[PDB]
């Protein structure tokens, strides 16, 4: 196994995957790491086991449908999945937690989003579909972009939104196009 937590790539106090050769730290992983459970295989071995069982979901599909879908256990996975994904870019840090707004020339936005906030959304259940995840995560970006402004820090919401769309549509196998 790997000697760093594969989210935040630091060493510490790790749990390593029985199936593949990735470690987490306890609240890196998502969900986090299970308490017993021997062998214990992480987020990525068990969205692999997914394709593997049905092939064919690999086959591209359009948003719209996606978005629409209920939040079974295999989409409330790949919608976890997804979520560590983004954390796994060291400017998730940026958005991770809950924000504040206090600069000239700038009003803050009407709802205020961040990363755990997400997380704990998907921890409690609250999203019905697919739609609920997505819209949260693309309000975190769009709500940086209109805040900051011209200001050139706009460009990290720009950096994780690429991030966090180039994740969704490999993991809910989006159609390619032009
Ligand atoms: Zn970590
Ligand atoms: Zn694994
Ligand atoms: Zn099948």
Sequence with gaps: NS???????????????????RSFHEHCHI???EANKNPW???????????????????????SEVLMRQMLPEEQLKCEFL????????????????????????????????????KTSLNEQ???????????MRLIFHNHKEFYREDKFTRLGIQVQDIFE??????????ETS
Aim: proline share 6%; aromatic share 12%.
């Design 3 to 21: 000697n760093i937590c594969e989210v935040c790539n630091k060493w510490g106090r790790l749990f390593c995957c029985d199936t593949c050769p």
């Design 31 to 33: 969900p986090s790491v």
């Design 41 to 63: 295989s992480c987020i990525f071995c068990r969205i692999k086991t997914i394709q593997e069982r049905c092939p064919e979901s690999q086959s591209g599909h359009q948003e």
């Design 83 to 118: 979520l560590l994904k983004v954390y796994c870019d060291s400017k998730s840090c940026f958005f991770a937690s809950e924000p504040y707004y206090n600069r000239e020339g700038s009003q803050g936005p009407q709802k205020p989003m961040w990363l755990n906030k997400v």
């Design 126 to 136: 609250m999203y019905t579909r697919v739609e609920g995840f997505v819209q949260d």
């Design 166 to 175: 180039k994740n969704f549509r490999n993991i809910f196998a989006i159609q």
